[PDB]
Each structure stands twice: as structure tokens, then as C-alpha cells.
Assembly symmetry: D2
């Protein structure tokens, strides 16, 4: 697509979906701000995509995030992608797991989104925000109760953001994928027997590719989805239909 | 997008969304079979898109449809778009309105999709089918109870088809728009006061454009949505978030 | 619960869920009009429940239905329960199965509900209508694409009826059960291995009992659910959370 | 309903829905453990329902909650009702508003539910847990973005808890009310014009009564809902159908 003249911000840009989203946006002419936790991931990325603006910060830290992004400038496109999975059965969920999960998976989405939306509103420009969610915001998954809860909350966050920012020409949508074999996908489907039966339950008999997720993100960021806001696109290989 | 070498079939191709979907697919290199009720619409459409293959049939007739399409040949992409709206308050719904609405809006989707899926399966090719639904498959609308019910049924038809055809590499999805000012949209939003109030409820403060729907249909038909099947994309200008 | 002084109409009263619903309402002091297809069922039910008003009619027949129910009189509680299952994989669905399924499972609901609602409105009394749907209005189930479609339409039929009749103080809800071992549950889960695997996927590790469905129907019909209308109660033994 | 021989624990028992739930359970024969923030509300409640067991603790404090409830003993029925509303438009949401809201509205539900569920499992007895959610877990509401997010999270929490605890015969459901004129309801619908518009959008043209909410909670806790788990009951006076 063509994002020339647009500036995008992608969180969780060091690995997986976020990294490939930065690469796709960079190839489409967008000026990209790449935010992630491990600096070495930004070092290699800047070598691969010359011209990106790296920002190393722990999005789970509100103060640090404010200091790091408070002054990054005009952002036209935002991809809230950073998240972490702390797998624990319900009866074993700890206070720390809950706190870390909501801070990174959801609180950072409120924070970065408000900073970016304020800017958009100030300049008087339309905008598009994509919240990377999961199919687990709708279906259950073993050992993912805390993570699922952060995605379920994201569903309403996306809906309410769309309602409140809509009058400002800002669209907000989510992408809800099934398992994607990045570091996170390999972690959750670690059990070979589980993965097997899990894949089998998918109508398409496969897991999603990173490319499939990146494609939906770009579609929602582009003007090709000008009347799409408030809901999401399932990249679940048909899992919800199972 | 590049649809060269692929053959598509679009129902309800004579006006509105269907007519523009034919134009967009034709412009993308696809051979297009245009099926519609009024023959004169096919005459004009053929001038605009030289090369389309016109088929004039009333899709509410199972026997006529079987004869008209039993031998159209290879179809790789299918857009089930034909539908009719018969506006009547619940207490005034007649057997006739019910029968016509279900024959055209839903039974034809079953029949044509069966015909096309058998062919795809026989040729051993993947396929992508798009069912044009409505946001009213999810939200109420005055005077549209029967029409809404056909769209509500479409949600499960879409999900079930995705589950059954997925192992054959066939993807099935729906597009769910809000009001789009085609002949059908203008008819449904006839009351000015109602239209004003309706528009105001939309977060984006507008109705959808035909182009917005067509963009989503092409996205779903393309290989850029390779892990999306069983659900739909809302082209509701944020209505479900209101 | 106490339904003394109220008159209810239950369709598909000759067997299963409908039969027990009649018994429960009868035991609660309600005057019951039992409508079913096979007369012999009405004859035995009348011995067991002296006082009920039997009506033998094929609900798939609009004219016979209008003739048989056009003058039953005041009805305060309506349970639309009659339905039939014609099992067929998607590529084998026939025009006949579609037509029979939609006329019995859905058109009859439109027709009987109109007659009853018109009466409640004339007399100026509040009312409660319960549409017996299924968990398959939401999840897929092998060989039930047509039946599932009729239930999906029922989801919207219920919302729209609640929306249009709400100002007349008439509530409309649905009960959505998983498999119940009536004659219908039996045929639908005739495959032993399939049944075992289906049962195992339910969080509660069981199918629903007829009593469970009847209990939710009664709850929705009662004044104990005075602010409930437009949605349904899942009697799915947790299936949707699987 | 009869809850004799059973022990229930209700959080947020000092006012509104929680207070009436304790009253209803007390009258139905259960021993009730009333958990709330303000001690004086428990003093007045014990007068009304002699025999209840008061527990004064701030549920937003994990450590204090653990000390306070770690030794309460056998619990058969749980009502996770405590919650707080901090009204703020999206662009004005603060770190503290987010943290407090998720600590009280959701983290406590994880914690208390874990303790109670471990007990039920340890004793080898079945259990029923009701999470008081809201219709805003599904629909947007002005100035309630943070609160809606906590309820959206509760939907997946409820669903995932039902999945994980189902094999232990523990049912988990939610009740999702529209505005109820308790102190919280008054706070939220303070603007008269807004409250007027809101009420008129409800198909039933009214807000829910506390009794309506309590009725559904008791139904879910009772064995009259033996195959209901994972979802919820809308006590929205038809709002979701508007
Ligand atoms: N893979 C899958 O199976 C699925 C993933 N998703 C979603 O996609 C998104 C991306 O996941 P995926 O690409 O798979 O994951 P990866 O683990 O591959 O990447 C996550 C990235 O986000 C970064 N990140 C995490 N926490 C922070 C933090 N506290 N501060 C700053 N950056 C952070 C990580 O940094 P670092 O490694 O340095 O900590 C990493 O660069 C997430 O929202 C996830 O929920 C949705 C469905 C499926
Ligand atoms: N416009 C809107 O507000 C919305 C529309 N939609 C959906 O989009 C789709 C297209 O709608 P739209 O373009 O607005 O409608 P139009 O009325 O503008 O066009 C519909 C087309 O379908 C054809 N068609 C209708 N019945 C038959 C039939 N029995 N046999 C063969 N062809 C038939 C019509 O032919 P003819 O005129 O000759 O009868 C016409 O060419 C429909 O599925 C509609 O439900 C969804 C949401 C909103
Ligand atoms: N059992 C299950 O697994 C589930 C059932 N349901 C729903 O529950 C409801 C009842 O099902 P259930 O009790 O199991 O089914 P049964 O087949 O056991 O009973 C259905 C009853 O309705 C009657 N009926 C069917 N067609 C007509 C008709 N054309 N005219 C008049 N009466 C008719 C049947 O009469 P007759 O025998 O004479 O034809 C029978 O009396 C249905 O809506 C079904 O969709 C939902 C989920 C699960
Ligand atoms: N009212 C409405 O319009 C609706 C309410 N609900 C839900 O119903 C439930 C009850 O609401 P409602 O009765 O109206 O509210 P009220 O404000 O009337 O009552 C809430 C009760 O919970 C207590 N509480 C709050 N925070 C804590 C805490 N940190 N620790 C211990 N107790 C606490 C309050 O104590 P204290 O006063 O001393 O702080 C109070 O006793 C909530 O979950 C709410 O989300 C859902 C939909 C609509």
C-alpha cells in the first residue's frame, strides 16, 4: 500500500508480529517509530530498515513510557502490539502475574493511545489505531486465563475508543489471531499433543502466519477500510467456527 | 489487486454493491460472471465492463437458478450479494414477504454456494466465498425484522460453511455494512428525521460508501486474508460501538 | 412459581421439552393450550394434565395454523418450541429440507407470535414470549447447517421482537440448550464416538436435562425476570466456554 | 428458593445490589458472609439480618484481603459483586484511575474466586459463583471506558473460569444489568438529558430494579440452573436489542 508521508508508531517492535509490521510499513513509505523492550532488537532492526526511530522502553512502566514517548512528535498510525504471556492455571494465578499482564497488555494501550490521539486531534488529522488482540478475547485457552482477560478487556477498550474518538475521524480496530508461531506462539503450544489436537480443531487445519496478521493490520491502517471502526478482524484460521 | 486468471461469480450484479464489485474485479483482471434479475442492467454493465459473462435469472427460483448456472463452468471466487428488503413492522409481516425474503436472501446463498463449492472441490483448487450480510445481523433496525432475520441466519450459514469447507481449503466470510446509499439504502433510510438520528448515532457520523464495502469484499476474496474464515468484517462506520 | 390466572400456549407440546413445559405450567396453575402435530400425543397428555386445551395442527402450514389458532383467545405466556431437525452435510442440503426447516422452525414463530402479541396489545396486558433456540445459533455442529441457520435467524427474530414489542411491555427471550436426550438429541448424537467426544468437550462433562431447559423457560416467563428481554439463557453445560 | 445448609459470601455487601443479595440469601436460609469496605454498613446490615458474618476489608488490597478471608471457612455460593466507577472520558484516564479500577473490579474477583474454589475442591463439593458484570461489557457508555474495560475482562474471566472449574462441578456465570438506581446508578446517569435519552432507547422504557438483578443472581446460584455456566443473563431491560 502507500503510507508515504505518514508516520507510524509500533509497540513491541523487537520481535514477531511487531517487527514484521515495522518492516512492512517501512517498505510502504511510512516513517516508523519502533518501540520495544530489548535494545539489541532495535539495533538489528535499524540495520535492516534504515531510517526508523528506535525507542527502548518497558511499556509496563507508566513513568518511563511517558518520558520516552511524551515528545515523539506527530503520529498518524498506531499499532498497539506489545504484550506478554504468563501461563498459569486459574488456581495458580499470582498477584505479580496479574499486575504485570495488565500493565503491559492493557494499561500501556490506554497510555500510548491517549498520547497519540491527543496529537491527532491537535493537528486536526484523521488517524487509524490497531490493537493487536487475540482469538482468546472470545474463546478459552488452557493456562491463559490472565492473558485472555487482558484481551477480553481490549475488546471493550477498542469499542469504547472507537465510540469516543470516532467524531474526531480516528478509527480504532483490533486484529484477533489464533496461534502464530513467533516466540509467543511456540511458548503456548509447547505441548506437542495439545498443538496437534489444537491445529486439528481449526477448520483450515493450520495456524496463522505472521504475514497473515501483518496484512490485516495494514488493511485496517489504510484508507481501504474507511468505514471500519470498533470491531476486529479474526485471523483465526476459522477457529471460532469450530 | 491481481485477480488475473481467476474466474468470479457475483450475484445481484445489476445495481449497487454488486455492480461495483463486478467493476472492481473486472478492473483487477478476473473473468467475471454477473448474475442479476433485470436483463437491462446486464446490457449497460457489459458496455462498461467489456468481457463480463451476463446471466439473467431470478435467484428466488431454485429450478430456474439450477438451469441458469448448472453449466457456467469454473468459479474461483464467489460473492453472494443479491438480496431484497421488504419493509414491514413485526405485526404486519405476511407469509409472502417472509417466503420471498428467505428464498432470495438465504436459500439462493445455499444453492449457488453448493454449486460453486462442488466445482472448486472437484478441480482441487482453493476458493474464497464472500456472503454480503448486514450490521442488522447483529443490531435491530425499524421495519426490517424479516430482512434482519435472513441476515441473522447468514451469520451461522457463514460460520457453518467455513467449518465444513475449511478442510477443502475454501474460505467463507461475510461483510456487514451499515446503511450504504444505493437503491436499498435510500429506501431503508427514507424518513429524514430517522436518517438524521441514525447518522448521528454512528461514531464516524456518516454512512458507508459503496467503495468501502467493495474494498472489504476484495480483501476477503484475496490471498491477503489467507487465515480469515468463518466471521466477518464490519463496514458499519462504528455503529456496533454506539 | 405461580402462574394462576394466566393462559399459556406451548407449541410442539406432544413430546420432549414442550411436553414437560406444559406439565410444569399446568402444575403451576396456568391454563395451557397445547399445540402439536401428532394427535395421539395430545390424547395421552390430556389424561396426565386434565384441563389443557389440545390443538392438533402442522405449524409448517400457514393456513392450517391460522385456522387452528386464529380464535384461541387470550394468551399471556407463549413458548415457541416446535422444531424439526433434518440432518444433511452442506453439499447435500436440498430445497425440500430448507423449505420444511424454515417454515416449521422459524415462519411458525413469526405467525404465532404475531397473533399472540396482537392479543396482548389489544387487552393492554404485559406478556412474556420464550423462543426455544439452541446453542447452535452460536456454535457449529456437524450435519446441522440448515437447522443451525434457522436458530441463527432466531437470535435476530428475538432481538427485533424485543425491540418492537418492548414499549407494549411484552418481553421476548430465548433459551439456548446444548444436546438434551429427547428424541431430537438422540438422533443428533446417534454416533457413539461423536457423542463421547462432544460430552468431553463440555466443561460440565454432561448434556443438559429436560428439567434444566424447562426451569429457564419458566424463569423467563415469570415476573422474576422483569428486566430481561432481547437475549437468551445458555443451557449449554458450558459448551460455549470450550 | 431454599439455600438451607449452605454458606454464601457476598462482596460489596454494604450497599445496593450486594446488600439486597445478602438479604435475599439470608431470607432463603443460607449463612451469609458479608464482605464490604465501610464497617458501619455491616453494623446496620447485621441488625436487619441477624446472624450474618461481617468482614470489613478493602478488596483492592491483595494482602489485606488474603488475611481477612484466608480463614473464613466453607463457602458454597459466591457473589463477586464489589466494584467502583471512576468516570473519565478516554483522553482523561489516569494511571491511578486505571489501577484502582482493575484492582477492585477484577483483581479481587480472581483472588476471592481462587480462595473459594480451592475450598470447594478441597471439600469435594459442587459450587456456584456469580460475577456481577454489566451490560457495558458489551455496549459502550460515555465516561465509562475504564469501568467498561474491567467488565469486558470479566466476560473472558467468567468464560475461562467456567472452562477450568467445570470438571470440578463448579458453575460460573455473570449477570449483566443496565443502569440500576443504586448510588452507582445515580452517579452514572447524573445528567438528566442523558438519562432521558438513555431510558428512551431501552425497548422496555425503564431501568432495572435491584430486585431484578437479585432475582437473576439467585436463579444462577440455585440448582434450577444446573446446566448453565460460562455466560451470563442480561438484566438490561432490552438495551442490547436497541
Ligand atoms: N504468537 C501468537 O500465537 C499470538 C500473538 N498475539 C498477539 O500479537 C502481539 C505480538 O505477539 P508476538 O509477535 O507473537 O510476540 P513476541 O513475543 O514474538 O513479541 C512480543 C514483542 O513485544 C515486546 N514487549 C513485551 N513486553 C514489552 C514491554 N513490557 N515493553 C516493551 N515491549 C514489550 C517484546 O519485547 P521483548 O522480547 O524484548 O520482551 C517483543 O519484542 C501481542 O499483542 C500478542 O498478544 C495474538 C494472537 C496470537
Ligand atoms: N444498501 C444498504 O444499506 C445495505 C446493503 N446490504 C447488502 O448488500 C447487498 C447489496 O445491496 P444493495 O447493493 O444496496 O442493493 P440494490 O437494491 O441496490 O441492488 C441489489 C441487486 O440484487 C439484485 N437482486 C435482488 N433480488 C434478486 C433476485 N431475486 N434475483 C437476482 N438478483 C436479484 C437486484 O436486481 P433487481 O434490481 O433487478 O431486482 C439488484 O441488482 C445485499 O445483500 C444487501 O442485503 C447490507 C447492508 C446495508
Ligand atoms: N434435544 C436437543 O438436543 C435440543 C432441542 N432444542 C430445541 O428444543 C425444542 C424442542 O426440541 P425437543 O423437545 O428435543 O424435540 P422433540 O422432537 O423431542 O419434540 C419436538 C416437538 O415439537 C413438535 N413439532 C415438530 N414439528 C411440528 C410441526 N410441524 N407442527 C407442530 N408441531 C411440531 C413435535 O411433534 P411430532 O413428533 O408430532 O412431529 C414434537 O411434539 C426445539 O425448538 C429444538 O430446536 C434445542 C437444543 C437442543
Ligand atoms: N448500579 C448500576 O447502574 C449497575 C451496577 N452494576 C454492578 O453491580 C455491582 C454492585 O453495584 P451497585 O450495588 O450499584 O454499587 P454501590 O456503589 O451501590 O455498591 C457497591 C458496594 O461495593 C463496595 N465496594 C466497592 N469497592 C470496594 C472495595 N474496594 N472493597 C470492598 N468493598 C467495596 C461498596 O462499598 P463502599 O460504599 O463502602 O465503598 C458498596 O458497599 C457492581 O459490580 C457494579 O459494577 C452493573 C450494572 C449496572
Amino acid at each position: 500500500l502507500n503510507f508515504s508521508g505518514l508516520r507510524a508508531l509500533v509497540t513491541g517492535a523487537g520481535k514477531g508480529i511487531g517487527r514484521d509490521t515495522v518492516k512492512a510499513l517501512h517498505a510502504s513509505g511510512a516513517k516508523v517509530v519502533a518501540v520495544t523492550r530489548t535494545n539489541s532488537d532495535l539495533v538489528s532492526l535499524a540495520k535492516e530498515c534504515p531510517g526508523i526511530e528506535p525507542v527502548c522502553v518497558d511499556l509496563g512502566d507508566w513513568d518511563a513510557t511517558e518520558k520516552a514517548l511524551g515528545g515523539i512528535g506527530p503520529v498518524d498510525l498506531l499499532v498497539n502490539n506489545a504484550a506478554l504471556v504468563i501461563m498459569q492455571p486459574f488456581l495458580e494465578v499470582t498477584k505479580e502475574a496479574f499486575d504485570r499482564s495488565f500493565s503491559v497488555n492493557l494499561r500501556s494501550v490506554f497510555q500510548v493511545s491517549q498520547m497519540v490521539a491527543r496529537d491527532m486531534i491537535n493537528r486536526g488529522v484523521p488517524g487509524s489505531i490497531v490493537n493487536v488482540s487475540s482469538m482468546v478475547a472470545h474463546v478459552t485457552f488452557p493456562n491463559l486465563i490472565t492473558y485472555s482477560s487482558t484481551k477480553g478487556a481490549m475488546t471493550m477498550l477498542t469499542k469504547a475508543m472507537a465510540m469516543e474518538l470516532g467524531p474526531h475521524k480516528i478509527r480504532v480496530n483490533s486484529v484477533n489471531p489464533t496461534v502464530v508461531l513467533t516466540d509467543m506462539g511456540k511458548k503456548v503450544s509447547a505441548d506437542p499433543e495439545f498443538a496437534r489436537k489444537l491445529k486439528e480443531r481449526h477448520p483450515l487445519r493450520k495456524f496463522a502466519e505472521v504475514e497473515d496478521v501483518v496484512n490485516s493490520i495494514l488493511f485496517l491502517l489504510s484508507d481501504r477500510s474507511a468505514s471500519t471502526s470498533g470491531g476486529g478482524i479474526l485471523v483465526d484460521a476459522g477457529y471460532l467456527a469450530s
